[PDB]
Amino acid sequence: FSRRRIAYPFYPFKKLGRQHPKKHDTNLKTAMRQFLGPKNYKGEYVMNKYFTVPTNHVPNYIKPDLERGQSLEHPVTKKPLQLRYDGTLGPPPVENKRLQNIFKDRLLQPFPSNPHCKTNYVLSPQLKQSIFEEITVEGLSAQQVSQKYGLKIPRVEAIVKLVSVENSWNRRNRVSSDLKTMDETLYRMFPVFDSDNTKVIYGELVEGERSQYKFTNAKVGKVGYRYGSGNRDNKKDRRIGFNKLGQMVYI
């Protein structure tokens, strides 16, 4: 058996009662408004748990199963606030023990359904600068630093490249106040990593010649475009690549 199942919230919510004929509302919209909470004149939803980003280096990921759909807290005191029959937000009768007892792994789990998905730790700027100094200045290999800091070699090389690019951008004053704010904010939203031959002929060039020929040695029977090769231009297996300029070319 299978049928269309409108994705109503799995948790309890306040369904529509008798409606004035012109409301033209839906239970889904009411559930969305209950999850969102009241909206400000500025357009914000301060009541919601997740409206504002975290700053304690611990992510704030949705936990609909643990909180049973109650996603409204006081913006300042950060204490739970449930809808009441009078229509106001107020303290809950009994506080959910599940929300105090949260496993450390689940805090790094972005999506409630998938446990295997987890966020990655963000390296501190000091560690990146230390890696830059260790590699470029002290001449250490990527293997030794990767073993030293519990890191992987491709990540070490990427860190080297990124720190070099950051140094260049800081040289040109390209990093701006807004960019600094954005970097700082996204830094505090994530957990922080803890350290502990073929012959070649280059041709003669003459004035006025716009190009120079390059001749590569090759072996007969292996060099050339084959005769009768399959044509995939009109097939779903058509082969596409990108030029050195970056344009798209059929291969």
């Binding site: 559930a31 999850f35 759909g69 409630p112 491709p154 490249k161 950051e166 600094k180 954005m182 939203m189």
Partner: protein
């Protein structure tokens, strides 16, 4: 590609690769994918529906089938091999941008690439279907990333109305403080949990009528001056950048803020390096996805046989 149509419908409840408020609610209320009481074909169809709604929705079905790779890569807990069903889409440039938190959604990443705001190893790339190889460096224009991650820039009229309300509320607070400073100080300290000059320091603010002030931005900029908001209209400190100018994060950013395992990101420069293709290891899969392993298993079974 497909035309974006009802990507955030609450009734259908599909989850998309996006930071939408409606997408957030759809993800929040979903719970899990219900596979009980369904035949094998129905289970496979539901799994395909959900996973393709999230993974590569903008791709056409036949194009995804051609791009689909029946093989999977991996490198004590059980390794989730079949979460790698959609790992092939992760090397695409737009997907890399989205996973690097340089775009609010894969569609916005596609638009950023198509409009010439993205570079890969220093050469401009204008094709979202471009595929990255390990070690490839890509970067985005900083203004585009700030717009994608920053809050929306208000218009002059809306921000003027917000400033009217702000001036009004400041005047109300000033009146309350001046009339009864005792209870105001008591409330302030209680919320945190005397000198009469404090209430003298507070100053009223001239109420503003927008009918005469409309159409002239510098006049309003000079007239509006609040202790936090000095000499600019709400959200328009410098009305020439494409975002809410006093830069604050877009709303509902924390639910989707996920740091990838296969990309290394430098947000100061809006640069990133594609370390590797996502792989599956014991107890973890580097393919970010909101669906559990059985859903990907059923989608893989569907796409092995083309829905046969």
């Amino acid at each position: 590609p497909r035309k974006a149509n009802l990507l955030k419908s609450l009734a259908r409840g599909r989850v998309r690769t996006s930071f939408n408020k409606y997408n957030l609610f759809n993800l929040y209320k979903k719970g899990g994918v219900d596979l009980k009481s369904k035949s094998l074909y129905q289970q496979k169809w539901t799994a395909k529906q959900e996973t393709r709604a999230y993974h590569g929705e903008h791709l056409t079905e036949k194009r995804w089938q051609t791009v689909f790779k029946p093989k999977l890569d991996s490198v004590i807990k059980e390794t989730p091999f079949l979460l790698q069903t959609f790992a092939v889409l992760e090397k695409r440039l737009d997907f890399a941008l989205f996973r690097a938190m340089f775009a609010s959604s894969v569609r916005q990443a596609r638009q950023f690439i198509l409009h010439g705001n993205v570079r890969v190893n220093g050469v401009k790339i204008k094709h979202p279907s471009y595929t990255l190889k390990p070690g490839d460096m890509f970067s985005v224009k900083p203004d585009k990333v700030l717009e994608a991650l920053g809050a929306k820039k208000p218009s002059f009229q809306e921000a003027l109305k917000i400033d009217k309300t702000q001036i009004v509320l400041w005047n109300k607070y000033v009146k309350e403080a001046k009339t009864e400073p005792k209870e105001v100080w008591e409330k302030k300290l209680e919320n945190f949990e005397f000198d009469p000059k404090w209430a003298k320091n507070l100053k009223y603010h001239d109420p503003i009528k927008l009918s005469e002030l409309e159409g002239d931005e510098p006049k309003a900029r000079k007239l509006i001056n609040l202790p936090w908001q000095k000499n600019y209209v709400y959200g328009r400190q410098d009305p020439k950048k494409p975002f809410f100018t006093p830069w604050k994060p877009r709303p509902f950013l924390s639910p989707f803020a996920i740091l990838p395992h296969h990309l290394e990101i430098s947000f100061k420069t809006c640069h990133a390096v594609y370390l590797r293709d996502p792989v599956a290891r014991p107890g973890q899969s580097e393919v970010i996805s909101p669906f559990d392993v059985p859903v990907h298993e059923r989608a893989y079974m569907y796409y092995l046989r083309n829905g046969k």
